[model samples]
Target: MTLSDCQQELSLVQTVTRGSRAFLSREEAQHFVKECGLLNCEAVLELLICHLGGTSECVQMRALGAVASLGCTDLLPQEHILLLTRPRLQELSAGSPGPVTNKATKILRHFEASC
Candidate 1:
């Protein structure tokens, strides 16, 4: 598919998967970020921050996963980590039981340690 088409598909998937028990595979998550040009896209990061500011745990987790998948850990700040590690995320992790949290934690840790 064309790049724009791929981005549209990824956005659709994000919308559908948001707040659900579904989690994206590593490849799928990476492809979504790359296709959306979120690697260094400030607009995309702002949109993600908006989602994280919302109350839905699913949205927050998905946003975290999206950011983590982009491998832009340096772009994330301590406040972002605090939000991601909040009790809501713990509850979400308990309910969904996926690698999203684990991966996010790893990314955050790496970011803190190296950057």
Candidate 2:
């Protein structure tokens, strides 16, 4: 996938987070099953964060990285925190040692006094 695809992955997170089993729940896991495929900008951040610290999976980390690289910066600084916050980013940043945390904090700092 590309930049837009990363930004469009929000629904997958929701489907997975609510335990809807978007992909995991399906025995088929097919798009024809209504249980497959990915799902999108403000929507993307919430999705990414949900996966970031929300889930324990390392796979979603790749998506989180992709989304952060493209989506968050498009919004205003205040807009950046609308879906996530310093406290939350601090949480994400801590979970993976340096790499994940730095990315999380980089976004979080946009909304902070770390100016």
Candidate 3:
């Protein structure tokens, strides 16, 4: 798929799922990450994070899950992921109660260790 196609698909997935799928089917997510390249996908994610803010546990969890599924954790610069995840980690640590917090923590740990 073209980069724009992948972006559109991702947008659809986000809208349709409303960020609640515990495990996204690999087809679209993987394809977008591989075809669009890490930089572009990461930029999309950054924009999403900026727009969504850290308030919604569901959104934060879904974003983390999406990034982790892409397997581009190593490709992202350390500082970028660190900066992106710092507040998330803090928020999750502070007392966000749910499976989402645990999932996000695990994803953050993986990214942190990989960095």
Candidate 4:
């Protein structure tokens, strides 16, 4: 997608929550993950970073899925994600039993492996 198109999606990310019409459904979010092999979810992943740090379990869960998908991509673990990954992953992986934990686990699953 074009940069503007991606930016638009990033904006959309803000609205994609529990009660938004244009929400990013669980299935669609996962679709973006699976498409990582065929497309770049980096921009979405970057936006997802915001969700990853919040207490919103569901949001963090979905964001983690997207982040996991981009783990090994050239665009992934992008500057932003990379910058926050260590600290965030640590919190998530500390065994809190939520999206942060799930996210950390997903990262482990990829752990430099390709999609």
- lDDT (CA) per prediction: 0.52, 0.46, 0.57, 0.56
lDDT of 3 at 10: 57
Location of the lowest summed lDDT over 10 successive residues in candidate 2: 28-37
Model 4: pairs clashing at backbone N, Cα or C within 3 Å: 92-100
Task: Estimate TM-scores for all models.
Answer: 0.50, 0.43, 0.61, 0.53
lDDT of 3 by residue, 48-91 (tens): 44433544656655555565654454456765766776675556
Instruction: Pick the winner on TM-score between candidates 1 and 4.
Output: 4
Quote the RMSD, in angstroms, for model 2. Answer: 10.5
Model 4 per-residue lDDT tens digits across residues 7-111? 555654554434423235667655555554454455565566657765466666655655654554455545545554656666678875754576576675455
Stretches of candidate 4 exceeding 4 Å from the true structure: 1-7, 15-43, 72-74, 77-84, 112-115
Which candidate tops TM-score?
Answer: 3
Could you give candidate 2's per-residue lDDT for residues 1-115 as a string of tens digits?
3444553355554444443222232332232123222333445555555566546444344534434443334343455544454565667766656655665666656546423
Clash number for every model?
0, 4, 0, 1
Output the better candidate (1/4) by lDDT. 4
- Which residue pairs collide, candidate 2? 8-39, 8-40, 10-40, 93-101
* Model 1 Cα RMSD, 1 decimal: 7.9
- Quote the positional error of residue 79 for candidate 3 in Å: 4.3
Global Cα lDDT for candidate 2 = 0.46
